[PDB]
Design a binder for this molecule. Structure first.
Ligand SMILES: [Ca+2]
Ligand SMILES: [Cl-]
Ligand SMILES: [Zn+2]
Ligand SMILES: [Zn+2]
Ligand SMILES: [Zn+2]
Ligand SMILES: [Zn+2]
Lengths: 352, 360
């Protein structure tokens, strides 16, 4: 499903192949601890952050992201509670975006974990909190969306008509809203909210400019590309253009910025990684331009060029198809393509 | 009621004096821009909606700005607009400035073509307004969460708290349906409508991500609820975001209009088209500074809950449960602004009520 970074050697990993063991922490900067939780997908882990802090005279910790709601991840959090918090409480929970591996356990943490050790506030952007609430409170519409984009396998379309709430079983009933540019004081640092678009409604990245640390969430990952998909809720969305524009926010940061990604390892070379991501989507866009210059193309037609050797499952094709529509929509909305609905009800794109 | 009337209204210019379109009729306020006025059954008895002459993909028609609540009266007048005042051309799309029921309630009914299913068109909206409306349509001024929120801000009247719990369906009755898809508007986006390029100008504090539309070349501003000539814009703190700072957000958002050309024709959602956008911003700022000062003074005397500020902020007024809801939320907005800035200290008393006193 993901696109792997073959130019990883152009990045430098300041801790080489060190990984915190499940249930342990590793200090990546003074008062900034790295946690790694297991996930049962092809992406087998998420990195979470523990930040030493003091709010209103109470010493403690600010958590960044939560994990999915699994028994494994709950157990590792309790180990961390017992052993690696210096006996201090969590003071608040910051969540970068609504996706289940970042948000699933936000309510459990806010309610103090299995032993209800504290009661603290969720911090989140409005778009991520609203969308997660909506998704945690939720079909045929998705099947028709993909049908117009070339998914004609009758078995596949029927399966789609017939997951989030299991991983995000509960949502905090209140939140404190973060917005772009907000200053969040955490321990000795001023972290600045840096909003990102295209991947999710209103992704919150945190930048500590004085010492050059970036909690990049899923917007800048060293080993994989960031998913951008067009879904049925917003069928004319331009997430790829939104994503490429949001990347400009990191291109200007200091070259030695320590990037703390949600997947992969802490790395330096944020400007180098942005250049790789731009090249990748420009190469992927060019493949679409070429294909649409021969004959009109649907998203299902685009998938085998964009994603060579998928052998993909039904769930996998959902994100592959959504990414093709993202690339087709960028060129369509930019005037490089013309979109037409064929007699079979499928949407196709051709060069202008 | 709960709105603050503009005593300096004479400093604004109304290019159409006291002209008002009749219900079911339109009045042209600028080339290709028609004004509709719908009735509402509140103390605010109307909302202005906008019809913009347009052409998308070669099909001539109309882009609608805002919808009305879903009342029988408002549906009837819309059907009259379709039959008589559209030149027999279809609606092409519906733009909604924010999620509030009088702007959003009939968006789905409009998009699906009204009672006669005359067309099928796309909703245009900011992500924050669309998500929040969907959530509330599935609220701010009703439900057990709202009653507990206002109870800790000083509302003790047993009947009012009972009335608040039963308004669990206050929002869903006015917005009975919501469109299942949307086209996202963002700050700075250019929307080509007819002969104009309108720019999205986002505003905060009143609602999640309020969309105003600015046509810079000819000086037209569809201000939604952010700039109203006769009343202030409501800023409320609700249960979902209890430490919110909507007044700071609102006062900051007003800068986007403060710099606009002085000759700007403002098309507000309540009141009449006017000129004097800069003057009205100056009025609103002076107004919010005077209310903030009243709160500072009161909180220097004794600890004050929001319920204690309401009789000060809204002098000698008889408020029903709907009115008291927004009055209470605005008092919390003013208290929160001062608290978060460090001028006040917030403490919860043994009765569970939050009270504010000046920082010493
Ligand atoms: Ca938003
Ligand atoms: Cl757009
Ligand atoms: Zn993600
Ligand atoms: Zn992720
Ligand atoms: Zn409103
Ligand atoms: Zn309104």
């Amino acid at each position: 499903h993901h696109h792997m970074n073959a130019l990883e050697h152009q990045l430098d990993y300041p801790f080489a192949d060190t990984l915190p063991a499940a249930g342990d922490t590793f200090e990546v900067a003074p008062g900034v601890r790295w946690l790694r939780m297991p996930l049962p997908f092809s992406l087998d882990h998420i990195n979470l952050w523990l930040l030493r802090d003091e709010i209103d005279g109470q010493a403690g910790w600010t958590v960044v992201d939560c994990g999915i709601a699994s028994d494994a991840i709950r157990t590792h959090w309790e180990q961390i509670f017992d052993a690696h918090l210096d006996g201090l409480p969590v003071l608040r929970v910051i969540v970068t975006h609504c996706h289940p591996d970042h948000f699933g356990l936000a309510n459990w943490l806010c309610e103090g974990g299995d032993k209800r050790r504290w009661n603290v506030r969720l911090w989140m952007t409005l778009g991520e909190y609203m969308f997660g609430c909506l998704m945690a409170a939720g079909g045929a519409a998705a099947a028709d969306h993909f049908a117009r984009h070339g998914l004609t396998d009758a078995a596949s379309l029927e399966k789609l008509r017939n997951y989030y709430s299991d991983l995000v079983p509960a949502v905090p009933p209140r939140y404190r809203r973060l917005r772009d540019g907000d200053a969040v004081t955490i321990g000795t640092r001023t972290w600045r909210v840096v909003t990102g678009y295209g991947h999710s409604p209103e992704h919150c990245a945190l930048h500590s400019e004085a010492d050059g640390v970036l909690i990049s969430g899923d917007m800048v990952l060293p080993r994989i590309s960031t998913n951008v998909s067009v879904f049925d809720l917003e069928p004319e969305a331009n997430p790829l253009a939104l994503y490429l524009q949001s990347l400009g926010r990191y291109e200007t940061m200091a070259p030695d910025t320590l990037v703390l990604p949600s997947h992969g390892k802490p790395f330096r070379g944020v400007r180098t990684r942005i250049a790789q991501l731009r090249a990748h989507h420009d190469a992927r866009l060019d493949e679409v331009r070429v294909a649409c210059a021969e004959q009109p193309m649907s998203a299902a037609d685009i998938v085998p060029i964009m994603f060579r050797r998928r052998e993909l499952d039904i769930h996998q094709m959902t994100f592959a198809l959504g990414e093709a529509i993202a690339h087709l929509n960028l060129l369509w909305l930019a005037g490089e393509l013309v979109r037409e609905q064929g007699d079979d009800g499928v949407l196709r794109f051709r060069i202008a």
